[PDB]
Design a protein around this ligand. Structure first.
Ligand SMILES: [Mg+2]
Ligand SMILES: [Mg+2]
Ligand SMILES: [Mg+2]
Ligand SMILES: [Mg+2]
Ligand SMILES: [Mg+2]
Ligand SMILES: [Mg+2]
Ligand SMILES: [Mg+2]
Ligand SMILES: [Mg+2]
Ligand SMILES: [Mg+2]
Ligand SMILES: [Mg+2]
Ligand SMILES: [Mg+2]
Ligand SMILES: [Mg+2]
Ligand SMILES: [Mg+2]
Ligand SMILES: [Mg+2]
Ligand SMILES: [Mg+2]
Ligand SMILES: [Mg+2]
Ligand SMILES: [Mg+2]
Ligand SMILES: [Mg+2]
Ligand SMILES: [Mg+2]
Ligand SMILES: [Mg+2]
Ligand SMILES: [Mg+2]
Ligand SMILES: [Mg+2]
Ligand SMILES: [Mg+2]
Ligand SMILES: [Mg+2]
Ligand SMILES: [Mg+2]
Ligand SMILES: [Mg+2]
Ligand SMILES: [Mg+2]
Ligand SMILES: [Mg+2]
Ligand SMILES: [Mg+2]
Ligand SMILES: [Mg+2]
Ligand SMILES: [Mg+2]
Ligand SMILES: [Mg+2]
Ligand SMILES: [Mg+2]
Ligand SMILES: [Mg+2]
Ligand SMILES: [Mg+2]
Ligand SMILES: [Mg+2]
Ligand SMILES: [Mg+2]
Ligand SMILES: [Mg+2]
Ligand SMILES: [Mg+2]
Ligand SMILES: [Mg+2]
Ligand SMILES: [Mg+2]
Ligand SMILES: [Mg+2]
Ligand SMILES: [Mg+2]
Ligand SMILES: [Mg+2]
Ligand SMILES: [Mg+2]
Ligand SMILES: [Mg+2]
Ligand SMILES: [Mg+2]
Ligand SMILES: [Mg+2]
Ligand SMILES: [Mg+2]
Ligand SMILES: [Mg+2]
Ligand SMILES: [Mg+2]
Ligand SMILES: [Mg+2]
Ligand SMILES: [Mg+2]
Ligand SMILES: [Mg+2]
Ligand SMILES: [Mg+2]
Ligand SMILES: [Mg+2]
Ligand SMILES: [Mg+2]
Ligand SMILES: [Mg+2]
Ligand SMILES: [Mg+2]
Ligand SMILES: [Mg+2]
Ligand SMILES: [Mg+2]
Ligand SMILES: [Mg+2]
Ligand SMILES: [Mg+2]
Ligand SMILES: [Mg+2]
Ligand SMILES: [Mg+2]
Ligand SMILES: [Mg+2]
Ligand SMILES: [Mg+2]
Ligand SMILES: [Mg+2]
Ligand SMILES: [Mg+2]
Ligand SMILES: [Mg+2]
Ligand SMILES: [Mg+2]
Ligand SMILES: [Mg+2]
Ligand SMILES: [Mg+2]
Ligand SMILES: [Mg+2]
Ligand SMILES: [Mg+2]
Ligand SMILES: [Mg+2]
Ligand SMILES: [Mg+2]
Ligand SMILES: [Mg+2]
Ligand SMILES: [Mg+2]
Ligand SMILES: [Mg+2]
Ligand SMILES: [Mg+2]
Ligand SMILES: [Mg+2]
Ligand SMILES: [Mg+2]
Ligand SMILES: [Mg+2]
Ligand SMILES: [Mg+2]
Ligand SMILES: [Mg+2]
Ligand SMILES: [Mg+2]
Ligand SMILES: [Mg+2]
Ligand SMILES: [Mg+2]
Ligand SMILES: [Mg+2]
Ligand SMILES: [Mg+2]
Ligand SMILES: [Mg+2]
Ligand SMILES: [Mg+2]
Ligand SMILES: [Mg+2]
Ligand SMILES: [Mg+2]
Ligand SMILES: [Mg+2]
Ligand SMILES: [Mg+2]
Ligand SMILES: [Mg+2]
Ligand SMILES: [Mg+2]
Ligand SMILES: [Mg+2]
Ligand SMILES: [Mg+2]
Ligand SMILES: [Mg+2]
Ligand SMILES: [Mg+2]
Ligand SMILES: [Mg+2]
Ligand SMILES: [Mg+2]
Ligand SMILES: [Mg+2]
Ligand SMILES: [Mg+2]
Ligand SMILES: [Mg+2]
Ligand SMILES: [Mg+2]
Ligand SMILES: [Mg+2]
Ligand SMILES: [Mg+2]
Ligand SMILES: [Mg+2]
Ligand SMILES: [Mg+2]
Ligand SMILES: [Mg+2]
Ligand SMILES: [Mg+2]
Ligand SMILES: [Mg+2]
Ligand SMILES: [Mg+2]
Ligand SMILES: [Mg+2]
Ligand SMILES: [Mg+2]
Ligand SMILES: [Mg+2]
Ligand SMILES: [Mg+2]
Ligand SMILES: [Mg+2]
Ligand SMILES: [Mg+2]
Ligand SMILES: [Mg+2]
Ligand SMILES: [Mg+2]
Ligand SMILES: [Mg+2]
Ligand SMILES: [Mg+2]
Ligand SMILES: [Mg+2]
Ligand SMILES: [Mg+2]
Ligand SMILES: [Mg+2]
Ligand SMILES: [Mg+2]
Ligand SMILES: [Mg+2]
Ligand SMILES: [Mg+2]
Ligand SMILES: [Mg+2]
Ligand SMILES: [Mg+2]
Ligand SMILES: [Mg+2]
Ligand SMILES: [Mg+2]
Ligand SMILES: [Mg+2]
Ligand SMILES: [Mg+2]
Ligand SMILES: [Mg+2]
Ligand SMILES: [Mg+2]
Ligand SMILES: [Mg+2]
Ligand SMILES: [Mg+2]
Ligand SMILES: [Mg+2]
Ligand SMILES: [Mg+2]
Ligand SMILES: [Mg+2]
Ligand SMILES: [Mg+2]
Ligand SMILES: [Mg+2]
Ligand SMILES: [Mg+2]
Ligand SMILES: [Mg+2]
Ligand SMILES: [Mg+2]
Ligand SMILES: [Mg+2]
Ligand SMILES: [Mg+2]
Ligand SMILES: [Mg+2]
Ligand SMILES: [Mg+2]
Ligand SMILES: [Mg+2]
Ligand SMILES: [Mg+2]
Ligand SMILES: [Mg+2]
Ligand SMILES: [Mg+2]
Ligand SMILES: [Mg+2]
Ligand SMILES: [Mg+2]
Ligand SMILES: [Mg+2]
Ligand SMILES: [Mg+2]
Ligand SMILES: [Mg+2]
Ligand SMILES: [Mg+2]
Ligand SMILES: [Mg+2]
Ligand SMILES: [Mg+2]
Ligand SMILES: [Mg+2]
Ligand SMILES: [Mg+2]
Ligand SMILES: [Mg+2]
Ligand SMILES: [Mg+2]
Ligand SMILES: [Mg+2]
Ligand SMILES: [Mg+2]
Ligand SMILES: [Mg+2]
Ligand SMILES: [Mg+2]
Ligand SMILES: [Mg+2]
Ligand SMILES: [Mg+2]
Ligand SMILES: [Mg+2]
Ligand SMILES: [Mg+2]
Ligand SMILES: [Mg+2]
Ligand SMILES: [Mg+2]
Ligand SMILES: [Mg+2]
Ligand SMILES: [Mg+2]
Ligand SMILES: [Mg+2]
Ligand SMILES: [Mg+2]
Ligand SMILES: [Mg+2]
Ligand SMILES: [Mg+2]
Ligand SMILES: [Mg+2]
Ligand SMILES: [Mg+2]
Ligand SMILES: [Mg+2]
Lengths: 138, 125
RNA sequence: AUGUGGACCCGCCCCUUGGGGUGUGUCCAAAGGGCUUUGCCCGCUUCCGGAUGGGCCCGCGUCCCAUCAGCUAGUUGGUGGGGUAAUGGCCCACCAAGGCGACGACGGGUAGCCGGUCUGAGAGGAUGGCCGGCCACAGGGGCACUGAGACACGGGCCCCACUCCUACGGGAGGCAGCAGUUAGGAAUCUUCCGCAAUGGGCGCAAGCCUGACGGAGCGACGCCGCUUGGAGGAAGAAGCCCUUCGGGGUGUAAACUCCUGAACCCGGGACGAAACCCCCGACGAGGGGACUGACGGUACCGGGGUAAUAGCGCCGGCCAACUCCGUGCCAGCAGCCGCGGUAAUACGGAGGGCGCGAGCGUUACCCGGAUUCACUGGGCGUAAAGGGCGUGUAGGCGGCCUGGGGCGUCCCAUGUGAAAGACCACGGCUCAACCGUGGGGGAGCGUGGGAUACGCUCAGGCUAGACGGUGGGAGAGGGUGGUGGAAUUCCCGGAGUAGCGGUGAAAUGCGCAGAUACCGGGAGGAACGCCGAUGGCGAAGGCAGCCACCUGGUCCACCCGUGACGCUGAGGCGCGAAAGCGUGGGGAGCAAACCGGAUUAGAUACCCGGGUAGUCCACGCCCUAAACGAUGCGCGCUAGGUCUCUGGGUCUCCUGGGGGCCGAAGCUAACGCGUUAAGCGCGCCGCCUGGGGAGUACGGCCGCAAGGCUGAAACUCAAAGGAAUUGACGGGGGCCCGCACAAGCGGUGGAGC
RNA sequence: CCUACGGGCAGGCGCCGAGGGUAGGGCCCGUGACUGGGGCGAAGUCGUAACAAGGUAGCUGUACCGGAAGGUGCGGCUGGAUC
RNA sequence: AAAUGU
RNA sequence: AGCCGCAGUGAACAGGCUCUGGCGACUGUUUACCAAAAACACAGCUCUCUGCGAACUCGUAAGAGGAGGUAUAGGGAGCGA
RNA sequence: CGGUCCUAAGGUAGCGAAAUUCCUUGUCGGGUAAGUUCCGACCUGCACGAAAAGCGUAACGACCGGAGCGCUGUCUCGGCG
């Protein structure tokens, strides 16, 4: 059923990360795609590969992390410390080019659908647009 | 809740009940003394506090507290009501201002004379 | 009468909702006064423009109660009329039967709306007082007249209420204008000056009117500025406080010595005022010339010149500031927590200290803190909170691909967003408060132009969601009709005695009228032992001997068909244990109420003997609950181990769907939850907002009734609470000791001292 | 009455019409002998219901009863100790 | 069988 | 659209209305000839009798009513929707 | 709440100065300028109380009681035909 697939993607990752895995498979879309992409372009992920599973298409998403720390709980820092849906079907979030995030002071990145597509806070500002804020990541 | 719900109802706006309804958004309210007597406070302590029952303007008759040491209030004595409960004595929610109308200040009081309607005494000669 | 020109009917013309042009026909204009008079000026009448001010209309926005859920006869539309500057059901006829409402009509309560204002990090919340914009009213109502304009505060008619005058012969008035009076109230001023200036009316203009306005007056009501002094001045008097009697404190404070000098006295003295007018030029352009200041002899300037009011709150914690004395749960304090019971930093005074200062406190109210209505920005297992469980209407939300549309959304440009205020920068009153100048920007809304990712939408396409086919599975799922055995009870027969029952022990009770116990027979009702489980089925309530019929849900395998048909669900509807209700049956066992026997201080209880409704059947109501997993539904994601029920499999094992335990990560206040989440997430619904009052009262709906649902407030408390910790206790448990009982020997209790 | 007389004004009639009157409803506030509970308040009276198996495990919906807490019946819940 | 304690 | 009168159901035949108690549910019955009522009756509830040649009633009896009925029937009693 | 005596058992619910209350015109409230009646309350029920039924009940009544409107020769108070 899935009321929101985009959230399901993000959430699938967030679930996968907190157990530190190699890959994370997720149902395919041309809009889920150009949403991921950035996550490789901004290097939040290794990247992905369009594959198929049981005759059905998915997107194996490969997870980056960090250094095997030491002390008790040697589990490394995440790359993705935080990620959450913003605009939702329950409440769609649109913003002018002005009204636009400064996620974790530049260190974070918003992701938005606009009249030119899946821009970022930085980009959309410079192209001068703004649109449907999908999510925030750091 | 959810957001849909929020459009359907919104959030309710608390409201605030007064605790000095005998006054009606007034700082004070003049009245007339009906009874003047002493009462016993909450077990917590014990004494004989001076309170007046006051019939005011608005037909109202409420118990008002008489503060300090002694006064000059028989029955038919014009008064002025302040605002502020006693806590010890239940039911009383109002004070009487001193030195106004038929109720006078506290005799030979040297300290907090702002209350107690006591004028400044002469110190030299 | 004139007609540039205008209006009206019909025409064509363009344009287009009664706009413009024209054709004919017919109707429309008037004014004179003064002169540096023979020329100009102030006016007159028609038309088109302009500009200003409006009228009407439209979209969007604008409070609380659904305990107000249905409203409507000019109501809604039409036709034709009446009316207006003009639209319109604005009014009137006639015709039609429409118009409005969970997107909250209708009704009720409160309110003038905005620019602003206060607070707030913000988002918000609060508010509309002075100033500005608009609406509305002018004692309460109605009405029209005149007019460019009003249905008119200081114009008019009428009715009412009220007050006043009068030879009473009858008539008069409308402060919410400026002051002022009264009354009400906790509370709000002068019955001042002047048109000098600004503005407004009239006039050619002098000039006139202006309680608009410019000033003055009263009030620490607010903001701001300023004074009651400055330098010196002791190892630091006196007095007053403490004191371990040594001393410490007030305290450079005073005194005292120098210096300045608020006030007050003298002199001078404004700006605010330049035009209207006047001269020349044409009274125009122009230079030029002239009158006028209420505030006021005021501010300010000079000189002279005097050390010249300080108060209020607090000093237990929060919260800055400590000591004697008095008091002795008294007198008293208190914003909360709380102080006072003969040693009080918490009362009262005192000394001292902290904090502001012509102010300091208090009360009332708004915002903050309160993330405590949570959009930003919260919760519902046990703290307040998941609807008892389904089905489903509206509604919200919606999977994968490609187009068109570009609604939302995004960008640009443009208009609008008034001034004032606020913010930034600089100036002006000796600073500031005030005040000026200039700049700074939207938000929204219209308009133009773009972009298609997303949502939307129209179209097309698939299959992973969902639905379906075929083959099957398990099951106390439900309804109807039958049927079996054990047992209790009662009746009959036989046999057989002297007691049976019952309890902690007894009694009431039954029994020589033949009881209990035993055999045989008969009638009747209810519930189904072992199987049976920590199991299965159902959405929940709930379902259990056995047979048949009717029948719901659900799981597995095969991967065939439909093509997003989905998820949730306010209302609606249906089901809903027990008790209880109605009408009829039925009634063995049991058993509220009732009676009795015991216990006990009493025992309207507990235990015992009796016992009626009810329990069971049919039909119809009632609709509650610890209706519980105290955990709403659907989908996706995130370790495993073990036990089990039930499918399928190349039957180890694998896989599917259930029922439990321990548990990764993670969550949690902890207890605990954990692929049967309380983890990570999305959709939708229900619900919470301190405790008591209270699931009460009023209203409404439902019910035969008992009652159910919806569901407050005044008032009152300063906590009510959740989980966990250490203790203590238990007529809780396990283990163990003590002359602690028991076992045993002497006494005390009686008598006399 | 005026002529500007096929006119106009007075004047008469009519519809509407402030409000007054009569009648019957609706909502709201105040008030009322008496009555119902509720809250608070002094070391008053009666008992022991609950918290330890609370000395009958407790709570619970409904029903009947009892001076009072409560008791009992039916079904339910464990938020019930205990070799 | 076994109550209470400003 | 009008006309006349003080007046048009122009004469005659036609309810006065409301609020609020007691009693009886209600239509009905009764003391012919002083009481119409809150008395009787009434549908309805309960008790009790009665297995049929019923009980009960009338009659010495025969007989008959009950009833050409048969416990959802019939008789008696009290209460009275 | 307790004690004690007695009883077969000691009047529950609900009503109550009542078609029932002697004292009595009980006391209080309403109504009226004034109310032994009436209506509503209290309970000290001389002497209510559950099928000789208890407490209510919409509708009905030539029953009995209290109040008001309307209207009257009933009346002030009579007069005429
Ligand atoms: Mg005390
Ligand atoms: Mg005390
Ligand atoms: Mg004080
Ligand atoms: Mg002419
Ligand atoms: Mg034209
Ligand atoms: Mg003219
Ligand atoms: Mg002349
Ligand atoms: Mg105008
Ligand atoms: Mg009409
Ligand atoms: Mg028309
Ligand atoms: Mg028209
Ligand atoms: Mg007009
Ligand atoms: Mg609403
Ligand atoms: Mg209104
Ligand atoms: Mg108003
Ligand atoms: Mg505002
Ligand atoms: Mg601000
Ligand atoms: Mg600010
Ligand atoms: Mg705001
Ligand atoms: Mg506002
Ligand atoms: Mg105000
Ligand atoms: Mg004002
Ligand atoms: Mg204004
Ligand atoms: Mg007035
Ligand atoms: Mg006027
Ligand atoms: Mg007027
Ligand atoms: Mg007006
Ligand atoms: Mg006036
Ligand atoms: Mg005035
Ligand atoms: Mg006064
Ligand atoms: Mg005044
Ligand atoms: Mg003034
Ligand atoms: Mg002037
Ligand atoms: Mg002027
Ligand atoms: Mg002029
Ligand atoms: Mg002149
Ligand atoms: Mg004048
Ligand atoms: Mg004047
Ligand atoms: Mg002025
Ligand atoms: Mg001043
Ligand atoms: Mg003052
Ligand atoms: Mg010293
Ligand atoms: Mg000294
Ligand atoms: Mg000095
Ligand atoms: Mg000098
Ligand atoms: Mg001078
Ligand atoms: Mg002048
Ligand atoms: Mg000039
Ligand atoms: Mg000049
Ligand atoms: Mg001078
Ligand atoms: Mg001088
Ligand atoms: Mg001096
Ligand atoms: Mg000096
Ligand atoms: Mg202070
Ligand atoms: Mg402070
Ligand atoms: Mg301190
Ligand atoms: Mg001492
Ligand atoms: Mg002493
Ligand atoms: Mg002392
Ligand atoms: Mg002490
Ligand atoms: Mg203090
Ligand atoms: Mg003190
Ligand atoms: Mg001092
Ligand atoms: Mg001091
Ligand atoms: Mg929120
Ligand atoms: Mg919370
Ligand atoms: Mg939830
Ligand atoms: Mg609880
Ligand atoms: Mg709870
Ligand atoms: Mg539930
Ligand atoms: Mg439900
Ligand atoms: Mg329900
Ligand atoms: Mg739907
Ligand atoms: Mg949709
Ligand atoms: Mg879609
Ligand atoms: Mg703009
Ligand atoms: Mg396109
Ligand atoms: Mg599209
Ligand atoms: Mg399609
Ligand atoms: Mg099949
Ligand atoms: Mg099947
Ligand atoms: Mg089966
Ligand atoms: Mg079956
Ligand atoms: Mg069956
Ligand atoms: Mg025998
Ligand atoms: Mg025998
Ligand atoms: Mg015997
Ligand atoms: Mg015997
Ligand atoms: Mg014998
Ligand atoms: Mg036998
Ligand atoms: Mg199950
Ligand atoms: Mg169950
Ligand atoms: Mg089946
Ligand atoms: Mg297929
Ligand atoms: Mg196909
Ligand atoms: Mg559903
Ligand atoms: Mg509704
Ligand atoms: Mg039904
Ligand atoms: Mg039921
Ligand atoms: Mg039952
Ligand atoms: Mg009953
Ligand atoms: Mg029954
Ligand atoms: Mg029966
Ligand atoms: Mg028995
Ligand atoms: Mg007994
Ligand atoms: Mg006994
Ligand atoms: Mg005794
Ligand atoms: Mg028994
Ligand atoms: Mg619940
Ligand atoms: Mg659940
Ligand atoms: Mg639900
Ligand atoms: Mg199975
Ligand atoms: Mg198998
Ligand atoms: Mg499982
Ligand atoms: Mg576990
Ligand atoms: Mg672990
Ligand atoms: Mg598992
Ligand atoms: Mg509360
Ligand atoms: Mg409350
Ligand atoms: Mg409450
Ligand atoms: Mg209730
Ligand atoms: Mg209830
Ligand atoms: Mg209510
Ligand atoms: Mg009610
Ligand atoms: Mg409920
Ligand atoms: Mg606890
Ligand atoms: Mg222990
Ligand atoms: Mg123990
Ligand atoms: Mg032990
Ligand atoms: Mg011994
Ligand atoms: Mg011995
Ligand atoms: Mg001895
Ligand atoms: Mg002795
Ligand atoms: Mg002895
Ligand atoms: Mg009228
Ligand atoms: Mg009228
Ligand atoms: Mg009325
Ligand atoms: Mg009362
Ligand atoms: Mg007490
Ligand atoms: Mg108990
Ligand atoms: Mg106990
Ligand atoms: Mg006991
Ligand atoms: Mg117990
Ligand atoms: Mg317990
Ligand atoms: Mg019970
Ligand atoms: Mg009783
Ligand atoms: Mg008793
Ligand atoms: Mg209880
Ligand atoms: Mg039970
Ligand atoms: Mg259950
Ligand atoms: Mg006692
Ligand atoms: Mg007529
Ligand atoms: Mg007639
Ligand atoms: Mg006649
Ligand atoms: Mg008639
Ligand atoms: Mg009666
Ligand atoms: Mg009758
Ligand atoms: Mg009756
Ligand atoms: Mg009759
Ligand atoms: Mg007779
Ligand atoms: Mg006779
Ligand atoms: Mg007669
Ligand atoms: Mg009769
Ligand atoms: Mg015969
Ligand atoms: Mg015979
Ligand atoms: Mg015979
Ligand atoms: Mg015969
Ligand atoms: Mg026969
Ligand atoms: Mg019979
Ligand atoms: Mg009778
Ligand atoms: Mg006996
Ligand atoms: Mg009696
Ligand atoms: Mg009794
Ligand atoms: Mg009684
Ligand atoms: Mg009564
Ligand atoms: Mg009486
Ligand atoms: Mg009697
Ligand atoms: Mg009386
Ligand atoms: Mg009276
Ligand atoms: Mg009276
Ligand atoms: Mg009489
Ligand atoms: Mg009476
Ligand atoms: Mg009787
Ligand atoms: Mg009797
Ligand atoms: Mg009897
Ligand atoms: Mg009777
Ligand atoms: Mg009666
Ligand atoms: Mg009658
Ligand atoms: Mg006569
Ligand atoms: Mg005669």
């Amino acid at each position: 059923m899935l009321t929101d697939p985009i959230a399901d993607m993000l959430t699938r990752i967030r679930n996968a990360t907190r157990v530190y895995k190699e890959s994370t498979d997720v149902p395919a879309s041309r809009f889920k795609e150009e949403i991921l992409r950035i996550l490789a372009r901004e290097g939040f992920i290794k990247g992905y590969e369009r594959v198929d599973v049981d005759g059905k298409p998915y997107l194996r998403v490969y997870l980056k992390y960090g250094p095997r720390r030491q002390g008790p709980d040697p589990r490394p820092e995440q790359v993705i410390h935080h990620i959450r849906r913003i605009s939702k079907p329950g409440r769609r979030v649109y913003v002018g080019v002005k009204e636009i995030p400064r996620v974790r002071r530049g260190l974070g990145i918003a992701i938005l659908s606009t009249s030119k597509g899946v821009l970022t806070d930085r980009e959309a500002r410079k192209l001068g647009v703004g649109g449907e804020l999908i999510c925030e990541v750091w | 809740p959810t957001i849909n719900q929020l459009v359907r109802k919104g959030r309710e706006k608390v409201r605030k009940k007064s605790k000095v309804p005998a006054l009606k958004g007034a700082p004070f309210r003049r009245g007339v003394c009906t009874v003047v007597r002493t009462v016993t406070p909450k077990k917590p302590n014990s004494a004989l506090r001076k309170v007046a029952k006051v019939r005011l303007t608005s037909g109202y008759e409420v118990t008002a507290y008489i503060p300090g040491e002694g006064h000059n209030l028989q029955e038919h004595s014009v008064v002025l009501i302040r605002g502020g409960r006693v806590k010890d004595l239940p039911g009383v929610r109002y004070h009487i201002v001193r030195g106004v109308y038929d109720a006078a200040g506290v005799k030979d009081r040297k300290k907090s004379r702002s209350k107690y309607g006591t004028k400044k005494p002469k110190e030299a000669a």
